[PDB]
Symmetry: C2
Subunit: 90 residues, 2 copies
């Protein structure tokens, strides 16, 4: 068995760490490539509306190839889209 | 540092489980839904492991097309895609 709520938290935490590492002392490319991948796949750019916004302003590269800024204001954030994926509500 | 491998292993299992469930419609429990989402989000259909379960879902229209070569011609499996998500690959 595998717990649905639990595994959403696991993935969510996992993305947080990489976002957190990808935004600071970059040069990683690693946490940066997982962040870009998470962002293109789930169509989001922050653990929250605030961080997505921020991120789009300070580090646009990490956001979906064609996302914008304003959009990040209204479009769901990665944490929502992760829950959506685990409850098959996409 | 929630373990990348370990998380990736759990998401595989979680997908397998939804998989072992969208086959028996009886209270589909969005198991079908969960499957469909993973399939559209990660762009995959089933696993090389689990060939039977795969044949079943594909036949039950849980791996929709809409293109050409992937469009249900050359699948790509969810365990690989999931691995790719957690490694910032594709």
């Amino acid at each position: 068995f595998v717990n649905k709520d639990q595994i959403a938290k696991d993935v969510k935490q996992f993305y947080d760490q990489a976002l957190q590492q990808a935004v600071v002392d970059d040069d990683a490319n690693n946490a940066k490539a997982v962040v870009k991948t998470f962002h293109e796949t789930l169509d989001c750019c922050g653990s929250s509306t605030l961080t997505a916004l921020t991120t789009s302003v300070l580090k646009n590269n990490l956001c979906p190839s064609g996302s914008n800024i304003i959009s990040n204001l209204f479009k769901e954030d990665c944490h929502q889209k992760i829950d959506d994926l685990f409850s098959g509500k996409h």
